[PDB]
UniProtKB/Swiss-Prot annotation:
Domain-related comment: The ankyrin-repeat region is necessary for ATP-dependent protein disaggregase activity. It plays an important role in stabilizing the substrate-bound homododecamer by mediating contacts between the two homohexamers.
Tissue-specific expression: Widely expressed (at protein level). Expressed in fetal, as well as in adult tissues, with highest levels in adult brain, including thalamus, hippocampus, occipital cortex and parietal cortex. Low expression in granulocytes.
Identification of the protein by name: Mitochondrial disaggregase
More info: Hexamers display robustness and can tolerate some mutant subunits without loss of activity.
Organism expressing this protein natively: Homo sapiens
Description of post-translational modifications: Proteolytically cleaved by protease PARL. ATP-dependent protein disaggregase activity is stimulated by PARL-mediated cleavage of the N-terminal autoinhibitory peptide.
Residue spans of the ANK repeats: 5-34, 38-67, 105-135, 138-167
Quaternary structure and interacting proteins, as annotated: Homododecamer when substrate-bound; the homododecamer consists of 2 homohexamers stacked head-to-head via ANK repeat-mediated interactions. The active substrate-bound form is likely to exist in a dynamic equilibrium between homohexamers and homododecamers. Homotetradecamer in the unbound state which is remodeled upon substrate binding into the homododecamer. Interacts with PHB and PHB2. Interacts with MAVS; the interaction is enhanced by Sendai virus infection.
Disease affiliated with this protein: 3-methylglutaconic aciduria 7B: An autosomal recessive inborn error of metabolism with a highly variable phenotype. Primary disease symptoms are increased levels of 3-methylglutaconic acid, neurologic deterioration and neutropenia. Other common features include progressive encephalopathy, movement abnormalities, delayed psychomotor development,impaired intellectual development, cataracts, seizures, and recurrent infections.
Subcellular localization(s) per the UniProt record: Mitochondrion intermembrane space
Gene: CLPB
Entry's family note: Belongs to the ClpA/ClpB family.
Effect of residue 108 to M: In MGCA7B; increased ATP hydrolysis activity; severely decreased ATP-dependent protein disaggregase activity
Function statement: Functions as a regulatory ATPase and participates in secretion/protein trafficking process. Has ATP-dependent protein disaggregase activity and is required to maintain the solubility of key mitochondrial proteins. Involved in mitochondrial-mediated antiviral innate immunity, activates RIG-I-mediated signal transduction and production of IFNB1 and pro-inflammatory cytokine IL6. Plays a role in granulocyte differentiation.
Amino acid sequence: AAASNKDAALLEAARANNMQEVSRLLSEGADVNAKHRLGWTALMVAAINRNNSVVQVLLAAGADPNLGDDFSSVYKTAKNQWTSALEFRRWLGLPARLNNRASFKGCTALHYAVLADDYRTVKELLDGGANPLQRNEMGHTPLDYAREGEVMKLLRTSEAKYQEKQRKREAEERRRFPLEQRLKE
């Protein structure tokens, strides 16, 4: 049970913003990707907490930035279809009746950091390999949740660089590409 207990204690420490306990538990082999019964990982709850310090520690310990929230309850937001990103923000109480269903399933730490408009945590997650194009169950990217401002500007830049990196990784080997070939499929 020791291993299961370290996982559960790691999640409690992250939810409580206890950076010292998070670090201890990670060094003792707690599963950095463990999920709470409420659905979230330590990385996600650190993002909800706007704790960019704990986020950095988790990433340095190998946390997978692109795991999705397991919480699968669905809510009706009014008196179907997934609510829009703008109405999802409103439903969360943040600044700014057909599609009235809401779900957290699949939200990444980056979704939460952007919802919180937390530039420092957003930058940490992107620098640690978070995929800004990955969608949650409702089909929303983190950029869909951004307020205008520095987080939005950062995400636009990061989307372009992530797509560039992906295109370079998938690149096909070709020894020659004469200009005439641009005219042919």
